[PDB]
Paper text:
Similarly, in 2014, TuV was detected in feces of a Tunisian child with unexplained diarrhea and TuV IgG in one child and one adult from Finland. However, one exception was the diffuse electron density observed for amino acids 533–534 exclusively in the TuV map located near the 2-fold depression where only weak density was present for the main chain at a sigma (σ) threshold of one preventing reliable placement of amino acid side chains. The less ordered state in this region of the TuV map could be the result of the presence of multiple smaller amino acids 531-GAAV-534 conferring flexibility to this loop. TuV exhibits the most extended 5-fold channel among the known capsid structures of all members of the Parvovirinae with a radial distance of ~135 Å from the center of the capsid. The extended channel in TuV is not the result of amino acid insertions in the loop, but is instead caused by a different structural configuration of the DE loops which runs more radially upright from the capsid surface, compared to MVMp where the apex of the loop is tilted. While clearly separated in the CuV capsid and completely merged into a single “spinwheel” in MVMp, the 3-fold protrusions in the TuV capsid displayed an intermediate phenotype, with the protrusion almost fused at the 3-fold axis. The intermediate phenotype seen in the TuV capsid is due to this loop being truncated by 6 amino acids compared to MVMp and adopting an alternate conformation. In TuV, both VR1 and VR3 display less variability to MVMp (local RMSD 1.6 – 2.2 Å) with no insertion or deletion in VR1 and a single amino acid deletion in VR3. The readouts from these arrays showed approximately the same average signal fluorescent intensity for both viruses with strong signals over background for TuV and weaker signals for CuV (~5-fold over background with large error bars). In the TuV array the 17 top glycan binders all represent SIA containing carbohydrates (14 highest are shown in Figure 6).
Author numbering:
A (entry chain G), B (entry chain A), C (entry chain F): 19 to 565
The structure:
Amino acid sequence: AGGVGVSTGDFDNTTLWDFHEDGTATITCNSTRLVHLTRPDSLDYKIIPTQNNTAVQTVGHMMDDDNHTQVLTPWSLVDCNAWGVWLSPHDWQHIMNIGEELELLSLEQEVFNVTLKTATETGPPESRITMYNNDLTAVMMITTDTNNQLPYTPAAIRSETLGFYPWRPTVVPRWRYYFDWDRFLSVTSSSDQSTSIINHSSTQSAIGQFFVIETQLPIALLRTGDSYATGGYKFDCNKVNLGRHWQTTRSLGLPPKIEPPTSESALGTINQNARLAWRWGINDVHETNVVRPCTAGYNHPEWFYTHTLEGPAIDPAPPTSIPSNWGGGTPPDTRASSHNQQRITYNYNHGNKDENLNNFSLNPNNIEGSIINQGNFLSYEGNGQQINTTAGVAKNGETATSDPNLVRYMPNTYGVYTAVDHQGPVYPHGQIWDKQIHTDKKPELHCLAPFTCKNNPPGQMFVRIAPNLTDTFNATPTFSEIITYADFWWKGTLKMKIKLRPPHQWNIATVLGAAVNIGDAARFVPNRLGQLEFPVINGRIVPSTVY
Amino acid sequence: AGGVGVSTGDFDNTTLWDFHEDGTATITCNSTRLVHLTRPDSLDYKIIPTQNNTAVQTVGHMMDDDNHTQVLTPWSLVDCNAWGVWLSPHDWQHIMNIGEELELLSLEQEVFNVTLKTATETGPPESRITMYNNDLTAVMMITTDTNNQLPYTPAAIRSETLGFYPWRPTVVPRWRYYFDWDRFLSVTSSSDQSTSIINHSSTQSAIGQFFVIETQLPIALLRTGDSYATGGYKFDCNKVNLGRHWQTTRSLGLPPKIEPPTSESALGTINQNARLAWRWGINDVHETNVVRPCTAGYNHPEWFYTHTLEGPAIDPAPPTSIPSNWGGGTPPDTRASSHNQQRITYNYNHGNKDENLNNFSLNPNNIEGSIINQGNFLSYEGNGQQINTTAGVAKNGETATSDPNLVRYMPNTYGVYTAVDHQGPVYPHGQIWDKQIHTDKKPELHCLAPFTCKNNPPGQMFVRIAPNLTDTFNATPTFSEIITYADFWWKGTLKMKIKLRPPHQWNIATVLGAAVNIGDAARFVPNRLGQLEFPVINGRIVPSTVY
Amino acid sequence: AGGVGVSTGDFDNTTLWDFHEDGTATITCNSTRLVHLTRPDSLDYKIIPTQNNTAVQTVGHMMDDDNHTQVLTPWSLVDCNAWGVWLSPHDWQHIMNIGEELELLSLEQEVFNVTLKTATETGPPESRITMYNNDLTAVMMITTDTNNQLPYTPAAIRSETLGFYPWRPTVVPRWRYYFDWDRFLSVTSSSDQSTSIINHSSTQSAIGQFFVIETQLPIALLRTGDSYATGGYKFDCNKVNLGRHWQTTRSLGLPPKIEPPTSESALGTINQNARLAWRWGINDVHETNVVRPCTAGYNHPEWFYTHTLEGPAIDPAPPTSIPSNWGGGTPPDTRASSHNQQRITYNYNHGNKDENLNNFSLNPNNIEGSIINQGNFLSYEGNGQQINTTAGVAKNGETATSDPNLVRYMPNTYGVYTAVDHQGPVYPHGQIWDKQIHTDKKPELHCLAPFTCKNNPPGQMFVRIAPNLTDTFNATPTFSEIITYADFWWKGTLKMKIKLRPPHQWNIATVLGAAVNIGDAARFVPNRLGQLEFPVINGRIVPSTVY
């Protein structure tokens, strides 16, 4: 509640830890940034189809298809769904190291200190200078979508979120959403000809839904002395496990009875006739046969692109760990990308060191569901006889080297016994929460965000600069204006609950330290010139038993 | 409560709409028909095996196998589970147009005005005439199965339901159920020989269960003045979504940052280095790569017949939309039936125009889970390099044209990220509700009925004519009788709740109108001669956002 | 209640639907726009006569007479009486599709965020630049006319209403009213000479009434922090029927007794001696003779221009449907405009696609009162004898081809038995309400607006910019000023009640859909370049029985 020269709101980027008697803590992490808003290019909405030329015009690249249809709005999106907005590299270490599981509690946010200004270039065409002046009666438009009537676009994907540096100002993107279209692109190989390609794209204007912010939801017109607050929100969603499960399918159970070695250089051995009980098939009991409570993880066709009614698209399995340094004894033959891995491309605003673009490919440390793909093999019989993959009188199976398509590349072993893990949070760039799709069958996991809202997610927040007109305006498709921009302050608070992990074991545990695992430590702190980069860190570190 | 000349019950086929303050309505739709019952052929039960000759005796047709074992009862089934029993073409339009979701509430039914009669042919063998007389002390037998001890046979499949014309009388079928058998039929191609076929069918009389209506459940003997009522029933089941989701996997999310076109004939373009954040694999961010909340729909082996311990049978995926008119730019190569489609064969009683048989193949308008099958392709690496399908030093994947069996015909991409939709109600012929199978793992959807009873479904209802004997009866396997038939009135009431869809968008929505979409409008209304046909209409029409 | 940097009021363009237990709903549709006001040209009032030259100076065109007298005020009119201000194309569809009748409830409106500014051109005459600055102590003048002392000018005619685009700013016109004059223009044909024309126009300054806003009604002087509100208003007027009556005079009643056809290609026939009862005149009973409850619609002289004491003017009958595509079998001979039709000319502000002007001629779908004019004929006797139109011993009548003037062009059949319908609402351009003329005999309908206020209508609203003076002012007829303009926000809320139509019939009804009836669907949604047009739609669509 202030005027021209009275400020609203304050800057709090701190974090807090409130411990409780029952062995849990509450983490209050609040964040505040200065945002730079700029006027839209056109007053109205646009439905514009787009495509990538090199994908449709060359035979082999159908995986490059960008062809779609979207609608631009004269509105900008204020989104903080990434981790790196809320908490620092030290906060991440501290949560992962002592944490067992965490859950979301509440979210609230507001804007204040709006301060619009105008820019006017003057002088001769040789020396042109712009002057800046507060326009005190100018208005900025702001609204939040509650009841979630608009399409839901998370901005953590595509890296549009508020910036990660607490001491720098930030930019917002312009909001947009898809509009219905039809697409078909034929499959072609490095053989044949480009005149054989058929691409079909048509925007469907009868079926599509066209939303406008103005008629959907109410808007607050706010001048310099005004502020806007959402009022508070309460999450309802699943808890997230912070421990890494080292166990695989093969490590679940009671291990067999063995004879211990007498010498330090020696191996244990399993005596024949010490092999007893349950297994799958007809064979002696071996570590491969043993009946176990469930299978961990599953095979999935990779990488397999599915052609929807609009465009090709990819069907992933959850991401899993890739063996990194196995001292020679590696999987000899591996592909460019192996276990469902994910990459991110980000820029300076999101924690790159400089104005260039940076790329990072994630390798999770989750060991459980991971499948070395070259070692799969099929056996027509369980009998435990030597495998013969040559075509003839004795053909008892096939191996991933024999028919790679059938075994290595396109198995699907999903079934009733399978159990999988979400790859967990990813810092700074990961998405915190996501709404659930509205369908008869729901998914069992989401591809990125660890949290899934059971009820409606927190509503999306939009801003724009109201038009500022000269004296000659007649209502016409095009008209002169006054160049105007706004800089406002954003503040938000996210509350989470964490339970503390008690010491579970005798030997010393592996935690998240400095100078080796993450990298050179000097690379994450400021420079002589003031430069640093945000460490890209994995969500789960301290091991735990899954069964 | 009436005698010989006092009627019981009344005719109400009307529908009602009761609106509520909270934006929902109650739909009371009740239906009444005159049913013609005829005496059974044999007094007793029969366990009769059957087969189709042309399937076992020719090499290539194993998909024609009709071979099974059933038991005939001297009882008829009164079933109204189809939509077309309850409500008119205008009621269907009105529900779909303004409706958002609907749920079932209650069901009740009764029979009245029983009126049995006898028929006796007399006269010379040249001119033979039959006379008709009320037999006032004759009895009709009626019972309903509550507690659901008998096998559950829905009659909407096989088209045995009460007729769809409000102004015509109806027929009931004779009730029957399966009895255990063993079956094996070997697979043979258009090559080789018919002496190579081996068909095995044996009814198993030790294991099978044999039910008789008389000893399972109590029966009401009712004369002309008598009536019978079930007493009312209350559904517990899932709600059904009435909107069509236009979105696919590829339309879910925030669309990319693009450069808008300057000209009306022009396309948007995605600038390099404007490509940021999350995706699957190692490549630049493209519409195919982008990480999305979930995958919509899944690949499934089609059409794949599985051989159970009795007979072959087919494993479907849910039905989805087939691209119809795409202006040339179609999927070039498509099969006789493509996306899990379903057909129905029906007759005059169920809304055909005349005494012939009619066939209709359903095409749903649900766009979401549909998969154009010819566009699938596999990539051994995510690197985004040109695809090479020729065998040699560089083989980076395969396409649906390269190995159609592996890619097009027999993929299974089901997994943790998948989400699907039920194809929704179908009018007039669709099944309204279904009981759930009693198993450790339940299904996630049912193949036809939109509603799944959590508790026991409404009990099935049976009728028969009691035997009417001449004077010479001694208890013997075969005996003379008096020819007798009954005509009774059936009445039922189904209550449903619907929530009203508020206007969600700016542009004009697509609703269900006349004269174009359905067809010629003159074809659905009576003729000079009194003839009409029931429009076959899809359940969901007004689009909505799934995410 | 705010100052320089404190905003007043908020932006709400949303619509709402509140359903009720009795089967009606309340529609709250509120609208908000940014208005650009500019300073008047002259401080004072003007009484200026005008004329069109080409009408008085050429023989044949007396229908082009523009000659009148008006008075300009230094005031602008803020009017929202058009439909297209309040609600979107989807709202229109939704009301017409499920609505039966609607009535008006209340109206309220206010202005806020006034922000005046000044413009000053500076620099050399080669490069002249204007600068813009807030003048914080400047005042805008605003008043509303309650008690309705001023002449009532609806602005929906002449297309002066606030614009139809929710996301664009708007312009207001300058208010003006008629001042008494005398006019006579002689009738002349394409024959004779222009020296025979006599035009007489004299403004009458003794009789005429001269109103000034300043002395009639009080005015509020408001600066930037000020706002103005009218306080609310309550309609009292007639209800409006939303259904289209398909029936004509000839379809009202019990149809005759006929013999049905045996064949599908065949026609029913009316047996002689099956013709019984009431009719008009002496003849057998035919569909033309039958006594009916009333006559629907009436003949009227068209097009007939009446010369008032000032100028010629036209006497319309209500507009009715024109047969469009009748497959050949059309009315062979039709005029440029046939059944009392109406056109509208509108510009970009009111929903044209671009800066050009657009024209649309309305064809109502109301079938009832429409009269095909070429088929009228007169019979001197009712006897049913063959009509003879040749002059001689047997002349029993005349036909529209025989004497078109007497029969086709100048009949008036209005009388005691006649019944007519208003053509209903028209979107976006139609007028919502109108005040009733103050006379001994009132009209039975109004030409455009569906609603007629019984009490006083809502008062008209006026704005102007107060004069902003330089330092040299002495009171003189002409003086220097400071160039000043204002941009204010307008907000209003209109409440309506609608009753919901229950399903009335068996066959599928015709509703308002997309892609065919209205036109190309892509034409009503934004473009690649952001362009769209407002569909011009008719008020009544779902048929209903008038009797």
